[PDB]
Amino acid sequence: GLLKPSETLSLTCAVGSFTTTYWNWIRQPPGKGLEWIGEVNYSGNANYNPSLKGRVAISVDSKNQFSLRLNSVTAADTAIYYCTSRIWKGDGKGTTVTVSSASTKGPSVFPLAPSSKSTSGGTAALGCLVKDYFPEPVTVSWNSGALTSGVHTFPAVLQSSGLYSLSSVVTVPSSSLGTQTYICNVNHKPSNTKVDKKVEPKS
């Protein structure tokens, strides 16, 4: 799942016409394109991508499986890893891999509210800032799921500290900021952190 920098990434996938079968590893970093890692025939002849200057090792083993071994990992190696075969290619799923020097931490939840009072008739925006958590998976709802319209929960960003930050907003009519309550429902299962945050503007 997750591991620290300078450690060794090791994965294995299960396993036809072995003499003409090629086994490939590819990966996709978060929000980026697809990247080819290496290919291998049944004998053991090896080909890899130049960017991985020898830190990559792919071999097929007895057990019906083939492996991937990335040496001296970095935060740049954080990606979802896929393994495929080829005669015509093909093998979803995949394995999420996060390389980080951070520890598991629950998020702080802060209110997102306007500086000044809202003008009636128009639309008002409000929300929750879910800051400084690790690892990635955090979920947000509003009013226990009763409020879905106008809700925008944004993709998390990776801060320089190594911790993630996410914003969740909602736009509501201004003439209801006094008749309706708004609470963001934040759940970070990796740290068992559940927070209920009521956000209230004036008027």
Place this chain on the structure above:
Amino acid sequence: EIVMTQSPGTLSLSPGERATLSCRASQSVPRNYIGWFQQKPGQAPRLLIYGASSRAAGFPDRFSGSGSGTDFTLTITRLEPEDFAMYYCHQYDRLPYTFGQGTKLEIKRTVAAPSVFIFPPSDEQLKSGTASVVCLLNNFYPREAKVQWKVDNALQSGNSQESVTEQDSKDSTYSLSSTLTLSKADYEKHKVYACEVTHQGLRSPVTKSFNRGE
């Protein structure tokens, strides 16, 4: 190696129309070992085409690939709402195997200017020694938008992070969130905090601001 450039990069169409995606290789691809992958947000890449022309199982005959040498093409006839996604071209002919940068097939709609909101940092957070100022750009199209942070008219650079939502399933718009991060001291040392937004749907840039301490 063989670099691959895809075009248009961003294709904006509507359901029922015809989509044509292009993949150009720097050098020729002899055995036509060309593959096309479809990928929706949060999902694994699904193999759509292999051998440049052979359609994979799971995809209707609306999808077809053709081409040879250095030019390859993916065609999607009679576009359906589930066809709009990211598309990658791939060559597995000459080592090292490479990928195209991708083409985003999005739903085209009328131009919509963003609704801009600004949020000051909370007292809660200010008690911790860090200040986050947030700017929201709500429901705009197209996706391209620019945010400039100003603190007492000083242009901020390298201290903000943005993220954008996927195209909305209802109104086909995008939303953007930007966060300016400052220390509490620096935050208290200044008064006017402004988010300035530029977008092709805006007649002129829209600035939302506030004064620390009102």
